Design a binder for this molecule. Sequence first.
Ligand SMILES: O=NC(=O)CN(CCO)S(=O)(=O)c1ccc(F)cc1
Ligand SMILES: [Ca+2]
Ligand SMILES: [Ca+2]
Ligand SMILES: [Ca+2]
Ligand SMILES: [Zn+2]
Ligand SMILES: [Zn+2]
Length: 158
Amino acid sequence: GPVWRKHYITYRINNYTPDMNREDVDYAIRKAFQVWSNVTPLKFSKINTGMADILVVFARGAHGDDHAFDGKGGILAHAFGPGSGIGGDAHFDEDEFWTTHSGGTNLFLTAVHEIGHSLGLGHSSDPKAVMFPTYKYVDINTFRLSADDIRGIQSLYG
Ligand SMILES: O=NC(=O)CN(CCO)S(=O)(=O)c1ccc(F)cc1
Ligand SMILES: [Ca+2]
Ligand SMILES: [Ca+2]
Ligand SMILES: [Ca+2]
Ligand SMILES: [Zn+2]
Ligand SMILES: [Zn+2]
């Protein structure tokens, strides 16, 4: 499948969920990128203007791709694999309630999974993997990728 063919990757936060403090959205997304830069040669930089490799969007219902959101619950987020245009982009359903903690849906944990997709990972069948298709809260302060996640990403990079 497609991978980024360069080491310096940019992201931009298109818009901010009203569910969270702005600084907390920034930090959750930054931390989620760091999870992956920890285990690859990739470097991620937030840009505030122009065309980024990975655009982070909060939207609800139909939002201009072939992947309409479904209200609260169900689909929480989706992301596109590496490529031009919308490739790499990560979309979060605004009908969820995003948080920094165990309440609602945790943005950081969801973003780790979505960014996995943005980097070219598919889903894992291993329930221990962040790339497992089902969302479940785990303590964010001690979060670690599973062995399966690490072997998956290192099959693509580094
Ligand atoms: O990447 N998007 C998906 O895989 C779609 N989901 C459905 C499968 O039940 S999810 O939104 O539940 C979802 C989103 C992020 C996660 F970390 C887990 C589940
Ligand atoms: Ca939803
Ligand atoms: Ca893109
Ligand atoms: Ca919301
Ligand atoms: Zn979308
Ligand atoms: Zn997924």
